[PDB]
C-alpha cells in the first residue's frame, strides 16, 4: 500500500496513522461533489475554496470542495475527522534520520531548504527536550513552535497539530506554555501563587496586580510585578551531527507509459489521476499503481510529494 | 456540532458547543452566557496564537475536544 497522507488519530490509535482523503460539498456538507479536477498538492486540500466541483444534491448551489481526512487504521465513525500532518511522509527513498541515523518510516520532513528528515521517535525527543528547556519559539503570527532541529532559517512549523506527537498530557502542557508565553509577550504577568498560575493583563501604569476573577478564575493574591511577592511599598528589593544532517536530506540523497497503450503520459503536478490522451484507449489510471482509477487510490494517494 | 473546551491558566475548564464556521467572537459570547465574563475582557489563545474575533475555529483547524486558553483583560 502507498500512503501519501498521515493524520494524528486522537481517537483509539492515539498516534500518527496513515490517513484517508475525502471530499464533500462545502455548502451541504454531503459526499455529492464531483470535482472539476483532482487535487495535485497539499494547498489544494488544505486551503478552503480552492477546488471547484458540481454538487449532485438536489437544488444545492455549492460548487466548492471541502477536503477532510480520517484515520485509515481504525473503523471510523461517519462524523469524525483527524488532522492532516503534511510534514509527514512514507520514507520510500530510505533517507536516514538526522538524529539516530537509522532508516525509518514514516518520517517528518522539515520545510527548510535542506528538507531535513527526522524519524517520529527522534522528533518526539526533540519536542520533549525543547519543551522542558523552555526552548519553544513564540512567533506573533505562527504561535508556539519549533524550527528544524539543525536550526535552518524559515523552518518554523506552521501546522501546530504536529506537536500532538507529544501525547495528550504533553500536548496540553505545550498549549499551557504557549498561552503563558503569549501572555508574557503581551506585556502581562503570571500570578506567582502556587496552584494558581493565572494569566493577568495589567497596565504598565499599575504595578499593583490583583489576581482578579471568581469561581476559579483568580485567587485574589495582590502582588508586585518585580519581586513577585506581596504588594511592596514604593520600591523594595528583598547539538546536530554534521554528517547525519547531510545524509538526512529529502531531495539530495518525468513521464510514464499508459498501462494499456504504452503511449507516454505526462503527470499533472502531484495528482495520480491519469487520463490517456489517445482517443482509442483514453484509460483512466493511477500513476503509482498502474491499475484503473478507483476510490481506494483516491483515499490513499490522490496526490503525492 | 463540535465540542471544545475553554480553559483558564488556573485550570478551570468550560465546555462549549460550537459550529466550526462560528466566529471567535461567537465563542466569547458563549463564555459570557455561562460564566458571565464580558467578551471585551476575554482573550482567547490557541496553541500560543491569539485568536482573531473575525476568524473562525476552522481557520485554526480546531477539532472536537480541543482547548482554547482564556486570559482576563
Ligand atoms: Zn485511528
Ligand atoms: Zn451541495
Ligand atoms: Zn531517528
Ligand atoms: Zn533543516
Ligand atoms: Zn492567582
Ligand atoms: Zn516588590
Ligand atoms: Zn492508453
Ligand atoms: Zn494507486
Curated annotation (Swiss-Prot), chain A:
Result after altering residue 76 to A: Loss of phosphorylation. Reduced mitochondrial localization
Effect recorded for residue 258 to R: In PARK2; decreased binding to the TP53 promoter; abolishes TP53 transcriptional repression; fails to ubiquitinate SYT11 but does not loose ability to bind SYT11
E.C. code: 2.3.2.31
Annotated consequence of substituting residue 271 to A: Loss of activity
A single BP term in Gene Ontology: adult locomotory behavior
Description of activity control: In the autoinhibited state the side chain of Phe-303 inserts into a hydrophobic groove in RING-0, occluding the ubiquitin acceptor site Cys-271, whereas the REP repressor element binds RING-1 and blocks its E2-binding site.
Effect caused by changing residue 269 to E: Reduced self-ubiquitination
Region (TRIAD supradomain): 93-305
Record PTM text: ISGylated. Conjugated to ubiquitin-like protein ISG15 upon IFN-beta stimulation. ISGylation positively regulates its E3 ligase activity.
Consequence the record notes for mutating residue 210 to P: In PARK2; impairs folding of IBR domain
GO CC terms of this entry: aggresome; cytoplasm; cytosol; dopaminergic synapse; endoplasmic reticulum; endoplasmic reticulum membrane; glutamatergic synapse; Golgi apparatus
Binding site for Zn(2+) 4: 224, 227, 232, 236
Swiss-Prot/TrEMBL domain comment: The ubiquitin-like domain binds the PSMD4 subunit of 26S proteasomes.
Function: Functions within a multiprotein E3 ubiquitin ligase complex, catalyzing the covalent attachment of ubiquitin moieties onto substrate proteins. Substrates include SYT11 and VDAC1. Other substrates are BCL2, CCNE1, GPR37, RHOT1/MIRO1, MFN1, MFN2, STUB1, SNCAIP, SEPTIN5, TOMM20, USP30, ZNF746, MIRO1 and AIMP2. Mediates monoubiquitination as well as 'Lys-6', 'Lys-11', 'Lys-48'-linked and 'Lys-63'-linked polyubiquitination of substrates depending on the context.
Family indicated by similarity: Belongs to the RBR family. Parkin subfamily.
Protein name as catalogued: E3 ubiquitin-protein ligase parkin
Gene source species: Homo sapiens (Human)
Gene name per UniProt: PRKN
Included range, full protein: 142 to 465 of 465
Curated annotation (Swiss-Prot), chain B:
GO terms classed as biological process: anatomical structure morphogenesis; modification-dependent protein catabolic process; protein localization; protein modification process; protein neddylation; proteolysis; regulation of postsynapse assembly; regulation of proteolysis
Region (Interaction with UBE1C): 71-73
Tissues in which the UniProt entry reports expression: Highly expressed in heart, skeletal muscle, spleen, thymus, prostate, testis, ovary, colon and leukocytes.
Gene Ontology MF terms: protein tag activity; ubiquitin protein ligase binding
InterPro entries noted in UniProt: Nedd8-like (IPR038738), Ubiquitin-like_dom (IPR000626), Ubiquitin-like_domsf (IPR029071), Ubiquitin_CS (IPR019954), Ubiquitin_dom (IPR019956), Ubiquitin_ubiquitin-like (IPR050158)
Cellular location(s): Nucleus
First and last residue of the signal peptide: none
Name of the protein in its database record: Ubiquitin-like protein NEDD8
Primary gene name: NEDD8
Amino acid at each position: 500500500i502507498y500512503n501519501s497522507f498521515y493524520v494524528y488519530c486522537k481517537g483509539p490509535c492515539q498516534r500518527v496513522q496513515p490517513g484517508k482523503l475525502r471530499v464533500q460539498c462545502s455548502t451541504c456538507r454531503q459526499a455529492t461533489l464531483t470535482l472539476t479536477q483532482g487535487p495535485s498538492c497539499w494547498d489544494d486540500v488544505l486551503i478552503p475554496n480552492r477546488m471547484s466541483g458540481e454538487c449532485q444534491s438536489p437544488h444545492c448551489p455549492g460548487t466548492s470542495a471541502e477536503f477532510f481526512f480520517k484515520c485509515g487504521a481504525h473503523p471510523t465513525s461517519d462524523k469524525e475527522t483527524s488532522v492532516a500532518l503534511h510534514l509527514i511522509a512514507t520514507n520510500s527513498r530510505n533517507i536516514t534520520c538526522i538524529t539516530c541515523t537509522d532508516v525509518r518510516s514514516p518520517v517528518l520532513v522539515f520545510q527548510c531548504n535542506s528538507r531535513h528528515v527526522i524519524c517520529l521517535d527522534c522528533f518526539h525527543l526533540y519536542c520533549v527536550t525543547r519543551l522542558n528547556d523552555r526552548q519553544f519559539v513564540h512567533d506573533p503570527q505562527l504561535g508556539y513552535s519549533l524550527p528544524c532541529v539543525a536550526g535552518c532559517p524559515n523552518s518554523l512549523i506552521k501546522e501546530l497539530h504536529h506537536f500532538r506527537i507529544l501525547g495528550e498530557e504533553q500536548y496540553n502542557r505545550y498549549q499551557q506554555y504557549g498561552a503563558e508565553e503569549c501572555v508574557l509577550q503581551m506585556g502581562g504577568v503570571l500570578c506567582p501563587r502556587p496552584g494558581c498560575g493565572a494569566g493577568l493583563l495589567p497596565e504598565p501604569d499599575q504595578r499593583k496586580v490583583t489576581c482578579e476573577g471568581g469561581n476559579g478564575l483568580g485567587c485574589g493574591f495582590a502582588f508586585c510585578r518585580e519581586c513577585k511577592e506581596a504588594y511592596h511599598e514604593g520600591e523594595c528589593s528583598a547539538r546536530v551531527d554534521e554528517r547525519a544532517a547531510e545524509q538526512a536530506r529529502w531531495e539530495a540523497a518525468t513521464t510514464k507509459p499508459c498501462p494499456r497503450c504504452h503511449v507516454p503520459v505526462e503527470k499533472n503536478g502531484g495528482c495520480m489521476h491519469m487520463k490517456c490522451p489517445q482517443p482509442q484507449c483514453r484509460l483512466e489510471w493511477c500513476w503509482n499503481c498502474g491499475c484503473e482509477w478507483n476510490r481506494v487510490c483516491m483515499g490513499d494517494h490522490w496526490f503525492d510529494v | 456540532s463540535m465540542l471544545i473546551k475553554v480553559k483558564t491558566l488556573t485550570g478551570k475548564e468550560i465546555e462549549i458547543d460550537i459550529e466550526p464556521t462560528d466566529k471567535v467572537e461567537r465563542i466569547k459570547e458563549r463564555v459570557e452566557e455561562k460564566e458571565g465574563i464580558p467578551p471585551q475582557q476575554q482573550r482567547l489563545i490557541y496553541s500560543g496564537k491569539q485568536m482573531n474575533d473575525e476568524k473562525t475555529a476552522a481557520d485554526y483547524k480546531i477539532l472536537g475536544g480541543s482547548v482554547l486558553h482564556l486570559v482576563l483583560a
